[PDB]
């Protein structure tokens, strides 16, 4: 994984969507991996948040079957998974523990950077 953000904004299944809304306002992130400690359990994006009562807990609307990737895999292998399943953000897990995150944008930018490299 040459491309991933190791400072990951995560949530717990017992946090409320009112608190997740604050994280979107504070961090300007679309999705957040759901963790118990450092262990991935689910993922929640803006899709799954609108529109439920602010007291609703994350664990009831989060996606449990998370498409992730390992740090021992290439960034291009994640770009294939993101395109083959039309999935925005991919958590990066090692021993079931969230260590980073890579998403489409993160890899779409790599295309443009590689375009301009003939010096």
């Amino acid at each position, epitope marked *: 994984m040459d491309v991933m953000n190791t400072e990951v*904004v995560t949530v*717990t299944p017992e946090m409320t969507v009112s608190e997740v809304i*604050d994280l979107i306002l504070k961090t300007k992130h679309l999705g957040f991996p759901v963790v118990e*400690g*450092e262990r991935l359990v689910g993922i929640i994006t803006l899709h799954d948040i609108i529109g439920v009562e602010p007291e609703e807990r994350v664990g009831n609307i989060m996606s449990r079957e998370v498409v992730a990737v390992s740090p021992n895999q290439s960034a291009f292998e994640a770009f294939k998974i993101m395109s083959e399943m039309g999935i925005g953000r991919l958590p990066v897990v090692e021993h079931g523990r*969230v260590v980073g995150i890579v998403s489409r944008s993160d890899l779409m930018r790599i295309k443009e950077i590689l375009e301009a490299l003939e010096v």
Partner: nanobody
Amino acid sequence: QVQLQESGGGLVQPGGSLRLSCAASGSGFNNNAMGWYRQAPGKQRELVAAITSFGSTNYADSVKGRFTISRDNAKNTVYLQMNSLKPEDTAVYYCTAGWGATPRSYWGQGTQVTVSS
């Protein structure tokens, strides 16, 4: 912008209880999520417990129930209360600040907690 000064720690007999504290100073700090990471001699860095500005906690499986986290919003300081300290809890305990359930943006210098008989 962000500074994290850790306090507490040191020797503690096996099964005893010890508390850590971490003060958050600076103008770049504004009700951030604070947590505790540790690292044993040979092992890698590992989350112990974190707590957001809302008060939502997040513990590892390994210190769950034994360790409880709390914070003082006006003092902008966090408290890690360690109980029933096993010898595998001997590590350098780092204080972190950031956003979410696993804050890792800003780190402390680490305080040594030794659990030996």
